[PDB]
Design a protein around this nucleic acid. Structure first.
Lengths: 96, 99, 87, 84, 38, 302, 75, 66, 97, 74
DNA sequence: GCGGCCTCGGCACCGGGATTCTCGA
DNA sequence: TCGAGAATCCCGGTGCCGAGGCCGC
């Protein structure tokens, strides 16, 4: 995806807040509907804004799992609107 | 005063809410409008060779502003915007005593 | 039929006065006497028209029956006149 | 496509402008040729974009140059990736 | 089709003995023709 | 006869004498006469917000232009407090020949951007025709779909000029379950959408909603399990279909769905809500779905 | 607003330029000129607002309006 | 396709105008107008080539995606 | 016919002399005027020469006069400051002739 | 060179709505000047908005964007 | 701190992307 | 058998009316 505006923001909770504006080589990067990816820094779990689920989603996971030195990216199939609750669930951080 | 009259009339002429900061700049627009007009009436009345500014001295100017045409003459333009007691002074009515 | 004759005589009252009192107005310097100019407007509105004078002359007169509300200018092409549609 | 061929014949009329600038000595004769050009209108338009055509086509040609660059880059980096 | 002319010529008497130099009601002819009954 | 017949009807209705309406499965309603294919097809997949409309006094299906102007000049005046109003008789949205012909009210904005598209229909509503006098052209159903603001303006105009009153038709979960059952009993093919039942549990602090969406062919085979008498569906058959849903949901999630209330029953025939924004008309059964809807509107009027 | 100030336009025509002889109702013509100039301002500023799709007229639309209409209204 | 028939009609139109021509300078003006019409037909052929290049881009908008 | 032979012949004359002007002004800023560019600027000269003729006639009518003199075109030059300054010196050069 | 005398007589007199109005050679050569600077001004405004876009060609659209201030100004 | 004013936002109806599955290289 | 085109299931990304806030009397 040669024309993308990837903008990171290392938050203070130690979780890089990637934002990706997509666009193929034929088009300019589209900032109308970006795909924010909240990758917790050294965590195997990397939240993702389920914007459109295009052909970039298997490239979103692929780039995520190759940037962080992992090998397999799996959609957990956890899909919630409350990221502050997904953070609790996937980390078991809510009852502790 | 009169500039405040026109900015208030702007409200009922733009049919849409604006900002006061827009109004003091349209005040400079009216000030420059006169800064072009009163010396445009100056030069047009001098072009006619007359010291005073007769109504036809301004009809030519409004022809310059493209608002008087062969379709829209001077007097018809008075119909559409000026009130009756004011156009009674401008466009000649008839009583066998046309104004 | 009685209402027909009554309305007809009311018409010959109004129009007789339109001949008489309009000599208090009375024509002056083709122009077209305001009786004739008015009745040319009135004939046109009777069957519809928006032109009705195609800018009849003596401009003091054409704008006379415009300020009092007798006639109306065409809202788009203001060289043609209509008689305000009192119908 | 009526307005498009009206722009065609305005280019025709610009060329007419040019010839009349160069000719100017055939006034009745180019009256005749403007006559045959007007019935040429009546023969083509009656029977039957361009600035967007030319400009957008040049823009899209630069776009296809950019696309060939995209294929050069992506395909070659795919050759290197699958070479790995 | 005649009263519709009699409601047109009538209302151009309410608009001609108004806009002109009328001296409308200080006259005994017009006073019965002006104030035209509907 | 002119009123006392309606009083006796009110007596019969309030008596509540053994109601269970064994209803005929909505029969394939071959589009009667004209039924403008473009218009009706435009009117199908639109989410009509139902209302109950009392009979219109002094209405006539000849003076459509006069009402169109009278309402157009009223809507744009409510903007003073760009729009065209096209009253259009539908010519075929009627159950029997004696029903009043359904007519539309469309807020057409330049192009044909139909903002509101009202719809009054009276199909198989001969429980109201035989009780009201001739002066009233009764159309119990009113169909909105435009914004609620424009509906609450055209409704006011209709109250002002026709003495008709719009109660927002609310299909109770009982009637909702009924229609959810007779629509999976239909003889259709190529099911457009899954048979979804949007439940909504009555919890006081929270408002959990359930979408018990069944595969449309799978619900037809489940309906055939509880369908024994053909031609007409009974209240017990409807309740057994709904209880097979209950015993497939409480079986799975251990929460008694029967303790909840239906709020929306999407079906391949026609979606149907509760709060009013009810009738989507996916298939061309709309003379039967509208038959049920008008029969329900009589219940509210009468 | 249904007014046209007799005094204000005359005072402006005298303050700005001290040497003229504007006729009995010539200031009424000046008011008509300004009325139509502000008409053009209002309409072309509405066009400017739709150009940026701003639902309120602001400074950045009026300044663009001025350089078109004020220059156009020059004799 | 239709461009060849249009060019043939334009040449036939120029030939018919030359059949009714009156002078040698008028023939030169007609030849210049025919060259202008050839330029217009070249613009039409450039529009056809732009359609072909847009088809290539559509293939190029899928090959790159592939 | 006569309207066409009138305005097309002067469209030709305008294009011819304006093309001479195009070669005369293209040498300043090393520019080239394309065929449609010349065709446009010629017809704007034509269309706004209509405007100048509309203005200039009523300019003479304004001074209760039938002929067009230098003050009329000075009022035509009244429009813009930059060409007020340009036309002032070009007008004193007119008076030199 | 310029826009000559027998052509400036003819072009201006075409738009003349009456036959009895003439423009003198003293004013005629100045009319030559004012429309010559019509070409000069339209061309300089076009090439100025061209360097503003940094072009080596004056295209169709540049002239169309210069009319809203060309006809307004000139 | 209220009176007619205004501005976010849940719900919901209408507009393209990828999966079905039919047809051509 | 397979490759591009169309339609349509799945859920957006948008449109648009009540709720909350807010400034004279």
């Amino acid at each position: 995806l040669k024309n993308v505006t990837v903008s990171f923001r290392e938050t203070e909770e130690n979780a890089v807040w990637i934002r990706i504006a997509w666009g193929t080589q034929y088009t300019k990067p589209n900032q109308y509907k970006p795909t924010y990816v909240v990758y917790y820094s050294q965590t195997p779990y990397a939240f993702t804004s389920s914007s459109m689920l295009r052909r970039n989603t298997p490239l979103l996971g692929q780039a995520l799992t190759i940037a962080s030195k992992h090998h397999q990216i799996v959609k957990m199939d956890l899909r919630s609107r409350y990221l502050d609750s997904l953070k609790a669930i996937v980390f078991k951080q809510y009852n502790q | 005063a009169g500039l405040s009259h026109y900015v208030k009339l702007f409200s009922f002429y733009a049919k849409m809410p604006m900002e006061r900061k827009a109004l003091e700049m349209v005040e400079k627009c009216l000030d420059k409008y006169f800064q072009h007009l009163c010396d445009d009436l100056e030069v047009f009345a001098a072009h006619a060779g007359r010291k005073t500014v007769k109504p036809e001295d301004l009809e030519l100017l409004m022809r310059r502003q493209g608002l008087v045409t062969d379709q829209v003459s001077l007097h018809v333009l008075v119909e559409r915007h000026l009130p009756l007691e004011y156009r009674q002074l401008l466009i000649p009515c008839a009583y066998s005593g046309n104004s | 039929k009685t209402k027909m004759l009554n309305i007809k005589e009311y018409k010959e009252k109004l129009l007789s006065t339109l001949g008489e009192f309009l000599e208090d107005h009375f024509p002056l310097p083709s122009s077209v006497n305001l009786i004739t100019l008015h009745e040319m407007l009135e004939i046109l509105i009777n069957r519809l028209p928006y032109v009705k004078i195609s800018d009849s002359f003596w401009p003091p007169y054409v704008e006379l029956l415009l300020r009092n509300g007798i006639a109306l200018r065409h809202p788009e092409d203001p060289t043609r006149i209509r008689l305000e549609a009192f119908h | 496509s009526k307005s498009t061929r009206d722009h065609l014949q305005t280019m025709m009329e610009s060329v007419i402008m040019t010839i009349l600038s160069n000719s100017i000595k055939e006034k009745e004769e180019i009256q005749y040729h403007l006559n045959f050009l007007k019935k040429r209108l009546l023969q083509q338009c009656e029977t039957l974009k361009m600035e967007d055509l030319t400009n957008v086509s040049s823009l899209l040609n630069m776009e296809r140059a950019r696309d060939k660059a995209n294929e050069e880059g992506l395909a070659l980096l795919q050759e290197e990736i699958d070479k790995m | 089709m005649e009263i519709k002319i009699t409601t047109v010529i009538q209302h151009v008497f309410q608009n001609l003995i108004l806009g002109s130099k009328v001296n409308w009601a200080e006259d005994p002819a017009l006073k019965e023709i002006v104030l035209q009954l509907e | 006869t002119p009123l006392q017949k309606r009083l006796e009807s009110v007596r019969k209705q309030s008596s509540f004498i053994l109601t269970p309406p064994r209803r005929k499965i909505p029969q394939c309603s071959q589009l009667q006469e004209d039924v403008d294919p473009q218009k009706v097809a435009f009117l199908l997949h639109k989410q009509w917000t139902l209302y109950s409309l009392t009979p219109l006094y002094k209405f006539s299906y000849s003076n459509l232009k006069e009402y169109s102007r009278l309402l157009n000049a009223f809507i744009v005046a409510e903007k003073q407090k760009n729009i065209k109003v096209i009253f259009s008789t539908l010519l075929g949205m009627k159950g029997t020949q004696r029903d009043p012909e359904a007519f539309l009210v469309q807020i057409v904005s330049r192009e044909g951007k139909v903002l509101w598209t009202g719809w009054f229909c009276c199909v198989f509503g001969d429980s109201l025709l035989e009780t009201v006098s001739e002066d009233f052209t009764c159309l119990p159903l009113f169909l909105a779909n435009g914004a609620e603001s424009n509906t609450a303006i055209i409704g006011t105009w209709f109250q002002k000029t026709f003495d008709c009153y719009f109660s927002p038709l609310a299909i109770n979960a009982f009637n909702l379950s009924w229609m959810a059952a007779m629509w999976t009993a239909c003889k259709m093919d190529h099911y457009v959408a899954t048979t979804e039942f949007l439940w909504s549990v009555p919890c006081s602090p929270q408002s959990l909603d359930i979408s018990f969406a069944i595969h449309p062919e799978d619900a037809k085979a489940l309906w055939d399990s509880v369908h024994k008498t053909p031609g007409e569906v009974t209240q017990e058959e409807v309740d057994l279909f709904m209880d097979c849903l209950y015993s497939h949901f409480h079986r799975h999630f251990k929460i008694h769905l029967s303790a909840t209330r239906l709020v929306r029953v999407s079906t391949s025939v026609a979606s149907a809500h509760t709060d009013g924004k009810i009738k989507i008309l996916c298939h061309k059964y709309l003379i039967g779905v509208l038959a049920y809807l008008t029969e329900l509107a009589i219940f509210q009027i009468e | 607003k249904r007014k046209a100030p007799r005094g204000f336009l005359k005072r402006v025509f005298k303050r700005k330029k001290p040497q003229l002889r504007l006729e009995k109702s010539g200031d009424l013509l000046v008011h008509l000129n300004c009325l139509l100039f502000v008409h053009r301002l209002a309409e072309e500023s509405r066009t400017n607002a739709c150009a940026s799709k701003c639902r309120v007229i602001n400074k950045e639309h009026v300044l663009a309006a001025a350089k078109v209409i004020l220059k156009k209204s020059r004799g | 396709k239709e461009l060849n028939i249009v060019l043939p009609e334009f040449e036939k139109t120029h030939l018919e105008h030359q059949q009714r021509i009156e002078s040698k300078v008028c023939k030169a003006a007609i030849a210049t107008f025919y060259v202008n019409v050839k330029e217009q037909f070249i613009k039409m052929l450039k529009e056809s080539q732009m359609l072909t290049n847009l088809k290539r881009k559509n293939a190029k908008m899928i090959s790159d995606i592939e | 016919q006569q309207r066409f032979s009138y305005q097309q012949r002067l469209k030709a004359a305008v294009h011819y002399t304006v093309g001479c002007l195009c070669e005369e002004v293209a040498l300043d800023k090393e520019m080239q005027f394309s065929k449609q560019t010349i065709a446009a600027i010629s017809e704007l000269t034509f269309r706004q020469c209509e405007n100048f003729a509309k203005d200039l006639e009523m300019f003479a009518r304004h001074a209760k006069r039938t002929t067009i003199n230098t003050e009329d075109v000075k009022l035509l030059a009244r429009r813009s400051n930059s060409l007020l300054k340009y036309i002032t010196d070009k007008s004193e050069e007119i008076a030199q002739i | 060179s310029g826009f000559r005398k027998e052509l400036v007589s003819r072009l201006l007199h075409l738009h003349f709505k009456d036959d009895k109005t003439k423009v003198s050679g003293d004013a005629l050569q100045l009319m030559v000047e004012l429309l010559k600077v019509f070409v000069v001004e339209a061309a300089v405004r076009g090439v100025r908005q061209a360097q503003a876009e940094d072009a080596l060609r004056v295209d169709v659209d540049q002239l169309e964007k210069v009319l809203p201030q060309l006809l307004l100004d000139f």
